[PDB]
Symmetry: C3
């Protein structure tokens, strides 16, 4: 895109604030940002806030979101679709023009680990170019296993294709499949979907801990066979809804846009790979590491 040549918009922090017991303001950008998706490979991503996947959003069950999108893209319209919410797509997930802002309000009444993404046609193009993310809605009554959890992280799986190539997006295999982590607490890593960062800078944990991962596979196109090497999931909640409770899974199948909360124990010191078990995708980037130490 001629108006994107040379564009590299610095990442802008997510802006959130609570404005009532059940009401939260969120402000995001749509912006054009170079991201190194594999060593030596820059993708001029279409993004929320200069991250791909975008920044993590966390709300409480029952919160109404008053969402603003500020479109920094000089030429392409963008929009926002939160899978968490009940909304009229043709009124509430509509386009914001270049250099404009739009505000939309809708309720998050369901707990879970939801995808968000740009909803502008062609949606495949906007997703594939980077405009995806996760919103977590915390359940009012928690999860039954909350008390057993020692540590938690968020992981997101995505694919990358040939740059802005719709033929490839629709017909081709992914060039890369990747994990990213988005921070829940200070100190947590916050990374973009790339083939290497979570190998070089593993997630951390201690021996004996029960680890919770909030996970979502945002696609655009593939399903995920999510697995932690050297463990078994003690408990899984599909889509992060507490009622959708499975036990003792080795591998959790996630549809495109599918989420889960998974929990597992790391019993020994060492480094534990985290994969999609579709190993063509793992080979093409989708392996993260978890480094478990006596500390």
């Amino acid at each position: 895109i001629a108006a994107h040549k040379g564009v590299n918009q610095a990442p802008v922090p997510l802006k959130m604030e609570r404005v009532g017991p059940h009401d939260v303001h969120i402000e995001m950008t749509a912006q054009i940002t170079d991201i190194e998706i594999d060593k030596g490979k820059i993708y001029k991503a279409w993004t929320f806030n200069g991250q791909a996947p975008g920044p993590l959003v966390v709300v409480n069950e029952g919160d109404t979101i008053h969402f603003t999108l500020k479109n920094m893209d000089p030429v392409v319209p963008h929009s926002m679709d939160f899978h968490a919410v009940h909304a009229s797509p043709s009124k509430d997930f509509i386009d914001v023009m270049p250099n404009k802002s739009g505000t939309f309000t809708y309720p998050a009444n369901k707990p879970g680990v939801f995808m968000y993404h740009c909803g502008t046609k062609p949606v495949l193009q906007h997703i594939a170019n980077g405009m995806h993310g996760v919103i977590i809605v915390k359940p009012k009554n928690g999860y039954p296993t909350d008390k057993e959890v020692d540590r938690e992280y968020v992981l997101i799986q995505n694919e990358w294709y040939k740059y802005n190539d719709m033929n490839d997006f629709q017909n081709g295999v992914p060039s890369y499949v990747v994990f990213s982590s988005k921070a829940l607490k200070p100190g947590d890593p916050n990374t973009n979907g790339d083939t290497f960062t979570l190998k070089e800078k593993p997630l951390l944990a201690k021996v004996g801990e029960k680890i919770r991962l909030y996970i979502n596979n945002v696609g655009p196109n593939e399903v995920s066979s999510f697995h932690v090497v050297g463990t078994v999931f003690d408990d899984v909640y599909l889509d992060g809804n507490p009622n959708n409770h499975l036990q003792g899974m080795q591998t959790v199948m996630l549809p495109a846009s599918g989420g889960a909360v998974v929990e597992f124990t790391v019993t020994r010191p060492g480094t534990y790979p985290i994969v999609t078990h579709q190993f063509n995708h793992a080979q093409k980037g989708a392996v993260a590491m978890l480094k478990v130490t006596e500390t």
Copy 2:
């Protein structure tokens, strides 16, 4: 196929009648019918009754089906496999020759949303060319959420490939992925698997309604990540069996041949896309619309 050149057999209505408290007659055709699968694109489909997917069948749990296939195809044998039933495949899902009929009887003792299809080798060829459909078996005791449902429709996802091309069927990506709707009550739409009809003529509903969809992904080859934009599934029953109850799903993964009953609330007026969230497939046709109005 030389004997299919110029063949375009007019659609024939499904014939059903109840013949006892637990016994139902069904008569279908196998026939060769031109269907416009995308604008300007005619596929000379292999079909049940001149529809692809075929006509909807609905029975009650515990019904024995006395099924007749009348094969109108001038040269290819065809057969019928109902996933609802318990049957001997090598006696009961056998071939009917051109210009002949066959009658087979078997019981539907399980509730749910089942695929049916032609079972003639190579099965991939017969499925891919159009010979798939849905049979709904209504549970004797209903679903626990029946009383909350305001309106219902049936949707079916399928793919289309390069015409009668086995190499493509086995090795290629789909050319189109599509939704169709099949009528449960008078007035409901009844459409074929195409890229456009359910965009141009959305399904209808009113503001505030809880909508039930009976869905099946008949393939032949892909899995589906079924999602309604602007809502969350309140309740999902996998395969339509009442016991397989999930809550609060954003997206339901369906295997090839997989079914579900899903229920969701539309809270605001507007048009709500219905997709598979594998967006390469959505781009290639698999988006239907639901138009929600104050009436």
Copy 3:
């Protein structure tokens, strides 16, 4: 691989023995063995024990496994990852050099139907070349439906690609997708993943029986839509964990590495195909048969 030219190591039996109430020794080989994967097609597989998938392992919930791998491969290192166990991957699933042995100990505390495989980088290469299998962990308290089961077998789904071709492994469609069966009791068949053996020599059962299948789809890359023609699954336990209980499924979606215990009744004499319902994969080999007789 130059050092694999002309290598065809005769299959070696799995060695197992119990050494305490909760402790079991297992000894396997890594070895290079020609397997006929389709008629006329030899694949010089990388294997455990000269089988691909490898030999079946069955332990009890709560058993600690003291596992030895004897690497017979003249030039490539190999390793073992059991999805059943809790282990440190970087200490316990490490490489064994050519012509060496390694011993690793870890506990199987979760019931189910778990994949095992070689864990040597690149893992895709080692899996794709044949180094996969199943370990069954029997639940201490059984399954609630145990008393209804008349007969049982183990099936495994895998793919085969172009020989040792990483480009194909990562980017190409499978050349074959296959089922194998691994023996639970004397007399049961024990076969390799090929396109034909379970067609020519169907699994056997009697009319009226309830059949349990322990199934795993080891991939490397595809998901499976597992279905038995002419029946419906009465009961399904995802990953073989008794708590993950579904009823009345027509088709069970399995992720890559995903397992299940499925149970179904065969009501009439005849031959019942067993498929993945992704029919491109079925066409490419993944159909087994079950022959049901009055005896």
